[PDB]
Design a protein around this ligand. Structure first.
Ligand SMILES: Nc1nc2c(ncn2[C@@H]2O[C@H](COP(=O)(O)OP(=O)(O)OP(=O)(O)O)[C@@H](O)[C@H]2O)c(=O)[nH]1
Ligand SMILES: [Mg+2]
Lengths: 324, 52, 34, 100, 141
RNA sequence: AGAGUGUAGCUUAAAAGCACCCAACUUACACUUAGGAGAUUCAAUUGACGCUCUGA
RNA sequence: ACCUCGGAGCAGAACCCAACCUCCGAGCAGUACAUGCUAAGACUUCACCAGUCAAAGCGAACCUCAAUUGAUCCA
């Protein structure tokens, strides 16, 4: 018996008797591209994915490109493969043009939306900038998905963003110790006048990151919301715990997210200090424990098995003597 | 045909291993891992074990 | 051995021939289709 | 020879179990499925076995497959049957060991 | 002490937690097919007729960090977007973006001719000098 | 005079992907690597600058 | 002539099964000298014997394909 296909069988549309007259895959790369396209395309059969799933600006760009091409030095450098690019200028231009979209993809990849807004997304329009002052001569930035140690995050960071009120908020998406879903707030400035941040209302004082030892890597998120009109709101974990989902549900009418910046924090002696000095509690230490190795049910007669069979099931390695 | 020969460690240990070489080919000298010394060392053909 | 200026001139020659023979093939194909 | 499939789809499989024994490549290794010297398909993880059809992209070093695929019409794409192990348990969990 | 109330089992929801700890799984199969899926992050380069593009993509298929010369911010600084200079510049930009995104380790899966390509060599040199290492650490079992 | 109207050769692409060409490897082709050129006809969805068809 | 082993007729599609018969082949060769040591879990010619694959780990680098074979005792 033969059940007919439930859809267009692959390679069926092009199945023709003019194979000789049909152009072929002269190269491996073109076939690779076609195969990737097919894999991306949905199918009616079981697949691996099922189981493991302005005009003036254009004119200006054209004119600038024409000028760059006309510049002979640029052409000479390109043909001599010695030219370079201004990384800082490229970074700034990308931030202005399409940085929000890439930051959105990073947030989706890190799961902030699924964990903060239960899947609801947005775009960080405002090119926010956060930096934790390390020492006095420098300040480590906090990009989207950066990596900063709690020692560097000990003190509150400097925030800069060219805009005009604002509410800034810091959460530890996975720093909670009792309830998996909840998270701890570290500092929250509200009703920020324009750019200056010292004038913000400190609803909750500043806490440094405190990721427990051997607890993995914790993602900390700076959220920034545009604020239409001010609203009155409201070292203890019970009060630092909350959910950004319902928190922002309570204020979405006048608050709208427009900035994001998140980083990764590990354990540190500053975490020890945070747990002891001010949290006033014994710090928890977590260890990654793998499940015990699987062994089949022990047989009375382990036929053809090596002598190690019995050791696989013995628990104590020291000699035992029973009644004697 | 080929012959089975006993390559013996040149590191002074009694370690040996059997290899195959053409009878007409010259005697064999070969780098091989020596478990006793825990290091790759030279081995030299000592005697023909058998003919195969 | 060679200098930098002759290399630049050679590259410009390759560019200009690319343009010229691109136009040649385009006009040949246009005549074909016509 | 007693070859063929040893674990059909939906069967729970422990790491190391042989999924299918074959002479030729009837079924190809998927995700978390390793291939022995004799083309035996074994589970590299503990989970459920799933059979799917996937586009076949041979390794460039495979001269015969590359020649076959370059001799192919511009629209055609090869498909092969693949075996995957959908891991069940997580790699592990973080447990409180001491309240220092 | 109420503050000491800690659940016996921690729950780190960061997608990159185990991946960064070097304990997460990698798809170790697919031995008969190319490219290998045994990675956490992959550097994929697409050299079109006009544009050269690079992606840092997770095993699940999510694109994590993309650098395309199609973008104005990058194409407004080089003569040709389909040459060795374009490849090197886009590689440097991708290295900077990967560092700012926290992606330090990567897997590159070029074809023999792609690897032999001088532009690919320049792109790999740019990435490694930018900091991204094109060789992921081994899993810890 | 009327109709269809309109992105470089093609695109139920939105300034992109395929196309296309030479330089080297090929007797040669092909592959690959290096490079190359390219368009949304002009004014405010609308009218008129260019093409195809229907007539004299 | 044959007695062991591999492949086809040959199970139309999991496995195994057509003996007798028609046949076609093997009793190796080539490479390498980590072709080292260990070890979860599995397959298995319908018994046993025997024969297969193998994660992880140590130590290193950064097998091949049809069969190609033989137990105990004893030297
Ligand atoms: N393993 C092994 N044992 C052998 C071999 N040849 C002989 N034997 C031993 O000796 C027995 C056969 O004896 P014989 O037939 O007399 O052997 P032979 O080598 O022809 O003659 P003798 O040396 O006079 O015994 C075997 O059953 C074994 O015990 C051999 O090639 N291998
Ligand atoms: Mg059996």
């Amino acid at each position: 018996r033969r059940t007919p296909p439930l859809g267009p069988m692959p390679n069926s549309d092009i199945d023709l008797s003019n194979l000789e007259r049909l152009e072929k895959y002269r190269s491996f790369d073109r076939y690779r591209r076609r195969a990737e396209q097919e894999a991306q395309a949905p199918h009616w059969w079981r697949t691996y994915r099922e189981y493991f799933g302005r005009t003036q600006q254009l004119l200006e760009r054209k004119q600038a490109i024409q000028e760059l091409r006309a510049n002979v030095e640029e052409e000479r450098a390109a043909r001599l493969r010695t030219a370079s690019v201004p990384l800082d200028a490229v970074r700034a231009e990308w931030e202005r043009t399409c940085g929000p979209y890439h930051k959105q993809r990073l947030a989706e990849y890190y799961g902030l939306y699924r964990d903060l807004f239960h899947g609801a997304t947005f775009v960080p329009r405002v090119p926010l900038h956060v930096a934790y002052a390390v020492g006095e001569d420098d300040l480590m930035p906090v990009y989207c998905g950066n990596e900063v140690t709690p020692t560097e995050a000990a003190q509150a960071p400097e925030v800069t963003y060219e805009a005009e009120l604002w509410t800034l908020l810091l959460t530890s998406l996975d720093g909670h110790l009792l309830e998996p879903d909840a998270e701890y707030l570290h500092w929250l400035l509200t009703n920020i006048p324009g750019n200056r941040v010292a004038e913000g209302q400190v609803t909750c004082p500043y806490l440094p990151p405190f990721p427990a030892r051997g607890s993995g890597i914790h993602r900390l998120a700076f959220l920034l919301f545009k604020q239409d009109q001010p609203i009155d709101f409201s070292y203890q974990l019970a009060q630092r715990t909350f959910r950004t989902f319902d928190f922002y549900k309570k204020h979405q009418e006048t608050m709208t997210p427009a900035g994001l910046s998140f980083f990764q924090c590990r354990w540190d002696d500053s975490v020890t200090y945070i747990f002891h000095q001010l949290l006033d509690m014994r710090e928890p230490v977590f260890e990654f424990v793998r499940p015990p190795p699987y062994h089949p049910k022990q047989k009375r007669f382990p036929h053809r098995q090596p002598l190690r069979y019995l050791d696989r099931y013995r628990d104590s390695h020291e000699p035992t003597y029973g009644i004697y | 045909k080929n012959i089975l020969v006993r390559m013996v460690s040149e590191a002074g240990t009694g370690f040996c291993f059997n290899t195959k070489r053409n009878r007409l080919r010259e005697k064999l000298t070969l780098l091989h891992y020596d478990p006793v010394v825990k290091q790759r060392v030279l081995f030299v053909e000592k005697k023909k074990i058998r003919s195969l | 051995e060679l200098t930098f200026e002759e290399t630049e001139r050679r590259a410009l020659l390759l560019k200009k021939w690319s343009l010229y023979k691109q136009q040649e093939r385009k006009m040949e194909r246009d005549t074909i289709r016509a | 020879r007693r070859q063929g499939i040893k674990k059909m789809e939906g069967h729970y499989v422990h790491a190391g179990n042989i999924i299918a024994t074959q002479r030729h490549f009837r079924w190809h290794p998927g995700a978390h499925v390793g291939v022995g010297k004799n083309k035996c398909l074994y589970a590299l993880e503990e989970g459920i076995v799933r059979y799917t059809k996937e586009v076949y992209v041979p390794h460039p070093r495979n001269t015969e497959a590359v020649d076959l695929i370059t001799r192919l019409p511009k629209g055609a794409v090869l498909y092969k049957t693949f075996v995957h192990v959908v891991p069940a348990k997580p790699e592990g969990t973080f447990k409180l060991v001491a309240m220092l | 002490v109420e503050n000491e109330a800690v659940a016996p089992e921690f729950t780190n929801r960061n997608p990159r937690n185990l991946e960064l700890l070097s304990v997460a799984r990698k798809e170790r199969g697919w031995r008969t097919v190319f490219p290998s899926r045994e990675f956490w992050h992959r550097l994929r380069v697409i050299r079109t007729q006009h544009h050269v593009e690079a992606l840092v993509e997770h095993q699940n298929g999510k694109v994590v960090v993309s650098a395309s010369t199609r973008e104005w911010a990058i194409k407004k600084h080089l003569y040709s977007t389909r040459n060795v200079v374009a490849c090197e510049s886009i590689g440097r930009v991708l290295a900077q973006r990967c560092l700012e995104a926290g992606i330090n380790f990567m897997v590159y899966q070029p074809t023999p001719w792609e690897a032999a390509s001088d532009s690919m060599k320049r792109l790999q040199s740019a990435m490694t000098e930018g900091g991204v290492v094109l060789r992921e650490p081994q899993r810890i079992y």
